Amino acid sequence: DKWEMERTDITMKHKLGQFGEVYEGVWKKYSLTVAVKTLEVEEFLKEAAVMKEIKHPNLVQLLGVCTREPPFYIITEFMTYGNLLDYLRECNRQEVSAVVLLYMATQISSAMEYLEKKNFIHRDLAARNCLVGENHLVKVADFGLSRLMTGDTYTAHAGAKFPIKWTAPESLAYNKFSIKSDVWAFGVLLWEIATYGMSPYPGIDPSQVYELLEKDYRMERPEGCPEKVYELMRACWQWNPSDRPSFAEIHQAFETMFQESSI
Ligand SMILES: CCn1nccc1-c1c[nH]c2ncc(-c3ccc(N)c(C(=O)N(C)C)c3)cc12
Numbered sequence: 001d002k003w004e005m006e007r008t009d010i011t012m013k014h015k016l017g018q019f020g021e022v023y024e025g026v027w028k029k030y031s032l033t034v035a036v037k038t039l040e041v042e043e044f045l046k047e048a049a050v051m052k053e054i055k056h057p058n059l060v061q062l063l064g065v066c067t068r069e070p071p072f073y074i075i076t077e078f079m080t081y082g083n084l085l086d087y088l089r090e091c092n093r094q095e096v097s098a099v100v101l102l103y104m105a106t107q108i109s110s111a112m113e114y115l116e117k118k119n120f121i122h123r124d125l126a127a128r129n130c131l132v133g134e135n136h137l138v139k140v141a142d143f144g145l146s147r148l149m150t151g152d153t154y155t156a157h158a159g160a161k162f163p164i165k166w167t168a169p170e171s172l173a174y175n176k177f178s179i180k181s182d183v184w185a186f187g188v189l190l191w192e193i194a195t196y197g198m199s200p201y202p203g204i205d206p207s208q209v210y211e212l213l214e215k216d217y218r219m220e221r222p223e224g225c226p227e228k229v230y231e232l233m234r235a236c237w238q239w240n241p242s243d244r245p246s247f248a249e250i251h252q253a254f255e256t257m258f259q260e261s262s263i
């Protein structure tokens with residue numbers, strides 16, 4: 001297809017390794033700095049297939065694939081400032097102000113509304129899996145997206161391990177994932193943003209989080225976080241998946257807040 005590329009079109013500059021086999025590269029023809037994911041086989045090739053169907057300003061854009069013979073490449077745009085978590089921790093808070101925080105939440109929710117619309121599920125939404133470009137542009141990392149009709153559920157493989165503090169209670173107890181477990185994770189992401197990259201449930205060991213969530217314990221409102229934003233967080237953390245808002249509802253709320261904060 002139009003996506004298929006020659007391996008020799010790209011030269012690798014620097015290895016980037018929390019994301020795995022991921023490199024900074026050069027698309028020589030365009031003098032363009034790119035990101036390259038290299039390599040099981042069938043899972044990797046499906047990743048590439050799904051990414052061909054993703055087209056949104058706030059999801060990392062696929063540029064090309066090398067899938068004919070090993071070693072296999074997935075080539076995407078390069079996000080200059082790296083992951084959002086480290087970006088928030090290291091930022092100038094006078095530059096990355098409250099309105100900027102709303103702007104980033106609006107961008108992420110836009111991408112998630114798109115996935116909700118297009119029957120995709122993320123399953124690993126967190127600040128570490130969002131990427132930052134110039135001028136506070138934020139894009140959701142989309143290399144591990146899966147096909148799932150919005151409303152349907154996925155049952156994780158036996159012995160699966162999750163990032164507990166981002167993981168919805170139905171996922172923790174029953175290994176069940178849906179768009180609503182993404183909504184839960186987004187709530188935790190909101191908290192990460194509001195705190196400029198604090199670790200969620202600070203001091204609480206992961207193995208004790210589920211029992212607390214049962215008892216209706218939730219994280220308290222972060223310092224300086226608007227009540228409207230915290231109410232959205234808490235709506236995302238509703239015990240019953242069906243009681244949580246949709247990303248369409250969430251995006252509309254943030255877009256309104258961002259427009260009002262600008263005016
Ligand atoms: C498919 C390729 N891929 N797999 C995972 C992420 C990306 C990626 C795509 N586009 C990217 N654009 C930029 C970066 C990037 C750049 C600099 C950085 N310091 C970091 C960073 O946060 N650290 C801690 C290594 C991340 C990663 C990706």
